[PDB]
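pipeline/complex-builder :: batch 7 item 3
reading input block
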Amino acid sequence: LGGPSVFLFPPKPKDTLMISRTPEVTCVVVDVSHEDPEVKFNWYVDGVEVHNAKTKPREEQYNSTYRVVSVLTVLHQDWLNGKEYKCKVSNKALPAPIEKTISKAKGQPREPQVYTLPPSRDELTKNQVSLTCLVKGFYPSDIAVEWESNGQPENNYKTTPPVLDSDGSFFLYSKLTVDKSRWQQGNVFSCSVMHEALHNHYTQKSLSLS
Amino acid sequence: GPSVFLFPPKPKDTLMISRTPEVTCVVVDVSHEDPEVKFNWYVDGVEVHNAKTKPREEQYNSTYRVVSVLTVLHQDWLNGKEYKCKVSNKALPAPIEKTISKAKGQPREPQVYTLPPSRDELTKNQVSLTCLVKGFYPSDIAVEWESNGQPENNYKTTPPVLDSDGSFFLYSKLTVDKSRWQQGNVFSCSVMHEALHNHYTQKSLSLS
Ligand SMILES: *[C@@H]1O[C@H](CO[C@@H]2O[C@@H](C)[C@@H](O)[C@@H](O)[C@@H]2O)[C@@H](O[C@@H]2O[C@H](CO)[C@@H](O[C@@H]3O[C@H](CO[C@H]4O[C@H](CO)[C@@H](O)[C@H](O)[C@@H]4O[C@@H]4O[C@H](CO)[C@@H](O[C@@H]5O[C@H](CO)[C@H](O)[C@H](O)[C@H]5O)[C@H](O)[C@H]4NC(C)=O)[C@@H](O)[C@H](O[C@H]4O[C@H](CO)[C@@H](O)[C@H](O)[C@@H]4O[C@@H]4O[C@H](CO)[C@@H](O)[C@H](O)[C@H]4NC(C)=O)[C@@H]3O)[C@H](O)[C@H]2NC(C)=O)[C@H](O)[C@H]1NC(C)=O
Ligand SMILES: *[C@@H]1O[C@H](CO[C@@H]2O[C@@H](C)[C@@H](O)[C@@H](O)[C@@H]2O)[C@@H](O[C@@H]2O[C@H](CO)[C@@H](O[C@@H]3O[C@H](CO[C@H]4O[C@H](CO)[C@@H](O)[C@H](O)[C@@H]4O[C@@H]4O[C@H](CO)[C@@H](O[C@@H]5O[C@H](CO)[C@H](O)[C@H](O)[C@H]5O)[C@H](O)[C@H]4NC(C)=O)[C@@H](O)[C@H](O[C@H]4O[C@H](CO)[C@@H](O)[C@H](O)[C@@H]4O[C@@H]4O[C@H](CO)[C@@H](O)[C@H](O)[C@H]4NC(C)=O)[C@@H]3O)[C@H](O)[C@H]2NC(C)=O)[C@H](O)[C@H]1NC(C)=O
């Protein structure tokens, strides 16, 4: 016992922002029983049925239920224009098909402002210091943030989740931890942001000892 | 059917004697057919019965959200005692146990750093005052802002984030009219955490 359940996952924020990448919506059905293992997917874009999804064969799990995945490739401009993607899942153990819908959050997009903040005077008594990137005033909350210096990725960073601000836009901070020496030697560090409301879906802000 | 969820105290409440920390047992999706709920509470095994149940708010789906509330001792929670909630029903095949306690591990003191607005931002009507709090453990923490002894309220604080060393960090953003910052007012980020001496510290921020 335990009827099937459906989870619908959006594309990754970077994937809709760059045409070289492949944005996808993923419809996952879990807890499919052995007695009723047949699963049917119907896909709709703004209520209109589409037939180009790629559905995988069911995969039995170690708890003896089946998991079935259907992947719908989306056009970047369709996602950014706010189309609604509906996954309809039909199983003979279900009273009625299960429907899940996903889209970009509704609202007018807002351009992020990106500000770099150097380490506090207090922190420069430690061996590692904190380079901060503040990204505020953006909408919707889908965004990507990265760090680099001299063209190469800096991996020792963490980014807060987006946070709803009091004007209804979002903000976040990204913290990059570097060895104090590197900051003191005047290296330039770069915070880069990918968001739909930026020109070319991209901006960069630099930060160095001055 | 009914679902049962247990919630911990607010961090501020466990850190100040004058505040009242509580654990909270909430029950969703309870029907009129079967809307009668019971509660038992236990603390580190040793049962207690100084709890208190509340009014079963009916919700917009013919279900009755029910809630019990157990008051807890500050140092019991900070010493890691477990708090178990058992809700006996009759539409229940069996009773449902649910337990909660403070995150395990050596507490670590937050470092607090204030950062002033970026130069680029100073062309706006309002500016962002930043408070970085890092290196703390557990993630239970409270952050406030004030100026001239009075609370600043137009601020937002990120959730704690797991850092690479296993400690947590967060950021708090206070937004002020740029004129206030230009005048030279002093703004204060205050941080409450169990690993702080007297559970409290302040860092101040002014135009300099
Ligand atoms: C039997 O086993 C199965 C299988 O489990 C496996 O086998 C067993 C035996 C064990 O070994 C087990 O450890 C194994 O994992 C069990 O199946 C599980 O069933 C549960 C439900 O019971 C599912 O729980 C939901 O998980 C969601 C998150 O799933 C992702 O994250 C977890 C890790 O955190 C992964 O394990 C998952 O696979 C998912 O991973 C995501 O997968 C996507 C699809 O591939 C990825 O997206 C794609 O990725 C590519 C790559 O880049 C491209 O980018 C594509 O473009 C992109 O589409 C995605 O990146 C990937 N992420 C990660 C991190 O890996 C939760 O979302 C979900 O929560 C919702 O539902 C809850 C109610 O059930 C609710 O409480 C939650 O709040 C939430 O509700 C939603 O909330 C959000 C906001 O918070 C709202 O937006 C929604 O509206 C709201 N919906 C509501 C309210 O309805 C669940 O927690 C679990 O995922 C599933 N596992 C697997 C592997 O599928 C099964 O339970 C067992 N049965 C029994 C009886 O025991
Ligand atoms: C019928 O309606 C009801 C009511 O909803 C309302 O009515 C409908 C009609 C709509 O109008 C709707 O919009 C309305 O909201 C529906 O009710 C919901 O039912 C779901 C269950 O299906 C419940 O979802 C769980 O939520 C838990 C968190 O709840 C808090 O947060 C939400 C917001 O996110 C609030 O809505 C809640 O009220 C809770 O808010 C917290 O409340 C506490 C109690 O008061 C507060 O603490 C106290 O506060 C006081 C004063 O404020 C003192 O300070 C005390 O000191 C303090 O203790 C607290 O502050 C407050 N916080 C916030 C932020 O508001 C989730 O915990 C839970 O998730 C777990 O379980 C999931 C299973 O679904 C699982 O998927 C999750 O991943 C997660 O699993 C856990 O994971 C962690 C690790 O991450 C592990 O530790 C656990 O082991 C693991 N547990 C597992 C796996 O089991 C659920 O998501 C929801 O509570 C409830 N809504 C309400 C409002 O109560 C109902 O669904 C409808 N029915 C139908 C059939 O449609």
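note: Chain A has two domains: 4-103, 104-209.
queue -> next item
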